[PDB]
Amino acid sequence: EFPHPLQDSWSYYLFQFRKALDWDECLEKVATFSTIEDFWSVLTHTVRPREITYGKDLYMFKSDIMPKWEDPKNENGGRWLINVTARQDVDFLWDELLMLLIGSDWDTDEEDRQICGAVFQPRSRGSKLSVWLTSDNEEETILSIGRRIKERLELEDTIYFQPVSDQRSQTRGSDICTGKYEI
Amino acid sequence: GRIIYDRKFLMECRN
Numbered sequence A: 001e002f003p004h005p006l007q008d009s010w011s012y013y014l015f016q017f018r019k020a021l022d023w024d025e026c027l028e029k030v031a032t033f034s035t036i037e038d039f040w041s042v043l044t045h046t047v048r049p050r051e052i053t054y055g056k057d058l059y060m061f062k063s064d065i066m067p068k069w070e071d072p073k074n075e076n077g078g079r080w081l082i083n084v085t086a087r088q089d090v091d092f093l094w095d096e097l098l099m100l101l102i103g104s105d106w107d108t109d110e111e112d113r114q115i116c117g118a119v120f121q122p123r124s125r126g127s128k129l130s131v132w133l134t135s136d137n138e139e140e141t142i143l144s145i146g147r148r149i150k151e152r153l154e155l156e157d158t159i160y161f162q163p164v165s166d167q168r169s170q171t172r173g174s175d176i177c178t179g180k181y182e183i
Numbered sequence B: 001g002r003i004i005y006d007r008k009f010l011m012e013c014r015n
């Protein structure tokens, strides 16, 4: 009953677009947690991935890292992008993903140091999960993180590592999917 | 240092 402390404190954000708000003004921090117990409470008290309306997104980031490219810990970084398929349960994907992150179930300390946060993006065209990392060029560490994600999420399809520069320049609507790294 | 919890433990804490 004494709470179980986590390696990191994390903050949980909902992105909800409304006209006449800038991208970053569409984000709102709905919780900060630092224990296993408060982690699960957050997920029990917020919308399930399978229930969310399209275009309303979930961001979970280490608390001192803002969920935006502009953050120092993000600007020189990149994401592992996961393209969700029709057969996949997004609750399972999200829960497994957040468990991996909050429990810090990486083999090495350095892998945990790379982690910024995770993003769930429900889309009619095909939903996306991402893990944002602090660098775009720590090849070995980035690749072992990508491998661990695929294991935990039981992923079959190729996942893509995309530096922030490529995410920014990416035109909405484009059907091209590529990465600096792939596994 | 690093505080680590596996999914088995995390899920036992949940359910």
Ligand SMILES: C[n+]1cn([C@@H]2O[C@H](COP(=O)(O)OP(=O)(O)OP(=O)(O)OC[C@H]3O[C@@H](n4cnc5c(N)ncnc54)[C@H](O)[C@@H]3O)[C@@H](O)[C@H]2O)c2nc(N)[nH]c(=O)c21
Binding pocket: A016, A017, A021, A022, A023, A024, A026, A054, A055, A056, A067, A068, A069, A070, A121, A123, A168, A170, A172, A173
């Ligand atoms: C992560 N991110 C995304 N954007 C902006 O959001 C756009 C869409 O990024 P996405 O990852 O949501 O890509 P996707 O192709 O899935 O977008 P989609 O068009 O399906 O739209 C998804 C939702 O976001 C909204 N949206 C899309 N573009 C913008 C925008 N430029 N500003 C505000 N809302 C937007 C839509 O209304 C909808 O609700 C990017 O092209 C970029 O301009 C960011 N801008 C800054 N400055 N910093 C960021 O970190 C950032």
